[PDB]
Amino acid sequence: MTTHGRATHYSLGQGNTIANGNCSMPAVPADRMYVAVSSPEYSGAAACGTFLDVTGPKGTVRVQVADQCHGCEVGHLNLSEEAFRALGDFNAGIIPISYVTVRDPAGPTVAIRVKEGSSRWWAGLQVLNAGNRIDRVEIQAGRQWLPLTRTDYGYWVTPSPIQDGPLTVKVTDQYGRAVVLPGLRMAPGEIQRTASRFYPVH
Numbered sequence: 001m002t003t004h005g006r007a008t009h010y011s012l013g014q015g016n017t018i019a020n021g022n023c024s025m026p027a028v029p030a031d032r033m034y035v036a037v038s039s040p041e042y043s044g045a046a047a048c049g050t051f052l053d054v055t056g057p058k059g060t061v062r063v064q065v066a067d068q069c070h071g072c073e074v075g076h077l078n079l080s081e082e083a084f085r086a087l088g089d090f091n092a093g094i095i096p097i098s099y100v101t102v103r104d105p106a107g108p109t110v111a112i113r114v115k116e117g118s119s120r121w122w123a124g125l126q127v128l129n130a131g132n133r134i135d136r137v138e139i140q141a142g143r144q145w146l147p148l149t150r151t152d153y154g155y156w157v158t159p160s161p162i163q164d165g166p167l168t169v170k171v172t173d174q175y176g177r178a179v180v181l182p183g184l185r186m187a188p189g190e191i192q193r194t195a196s197r198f199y200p201v202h
């Protein structure tokens with residue numbers, strides 16, 4: 001649904017290659033089109049990875065939800081400086097906006113990043129390029145599926161130890177669509193590409 005609100009500007013800088021913004025992006029977007037949302041809209045990092053089409057005075061740009069703006073109220077987006085300048089005048093400081101969460105945006109294949117410090121005793125998984133909100137991330141334990149806990153920093157963590165060897169991970173989005181990612185390695189910090197998609201390329 002269309003949310004009507006306002007926008008201020010801030011920056012995540014050049015960032016690092018580990019964690020950028022509250023969603024813990026592996027990198028600050030090269031196009032510098034990102035946004036921090038209010039705490040209720042952040043929804044415990046459930047909005048991480050999703051994209052917003054934000055309509056401003058000078059048009060409409062697409063930005064990736066990347067961070068949590070604790071000081072922002074509902075409807076108040078904290079845009080990147082580049083996204084702000086493209087929508088309105090930078091000297092204005094505040095601009096009137098309206099935005100929607102993009103449903104199934106065109107993007108690359110799903111990628112999984114195992115967090116630093118992850119072992120068989122404890123592991124954190126980050127799902128990338130899913131396109132939409134993710135409701136469920138599970139690791140295969142024998143013939144059953146061990147559900148992971150959604151953290152408020154963009155990762156999914158194990159509530160209990162997992163088996164050794166390659167990981168078989170099932171990810172389910174907000175639309176009930178699920179993909180299974182076999183052969184995932186316990187490699188902390190690495191972005192593991194896949195050939196899986198929640199929706200086809202057209």
Ligand SMILES: OC[C@H]1O[C@@H](O[C@H]2[C@H](O)[C@@H](O)[C@H](O[C@H]3[C@H](O)[C@@H](O)[C@H](O[C@H]4[C@H](O)[C@@H](O)[C@H](O[C@H]5[C@H](O)[C@@H](O)[C@H](O[C@H]6[C@H](O)[C@@H](O)[C@H](O)O[C@@H]6CO)O[C@@H]5CO)O[C@@H]4CO)O[C@@H]3CO)O[C@@H]2CO)[C@H](O)[C@@H](O)[C@@H]1O
Nearest residue numbers: 019020021022023024025068115116117118119121122153
């Ligand atoms: O990006 C901007 C935002 O940043 C947020 O801050 C984040 C931060 O970026 C992020 O890095 C951080 O992530 C940390 C997790 O929160 C934390 O839980 C995690 O701790 C792990 C640890 O990495 C892991 O090594 C450890 O494994 C233990 C295991 O627990 C223990 O059971 C096991 O013991 C077994 C023995 O090894 C075994 O011999 C014996 O037989 O059995 C034992 C068990 O019975 O030992 C292993 C180690 O070998 O587990 C812990 C968790 O329990 O570390 C992460 C970092 O690496 O999270 C931050 C958020 O909380 C800001 O908060 C936000 O404001 C910014 O916007």
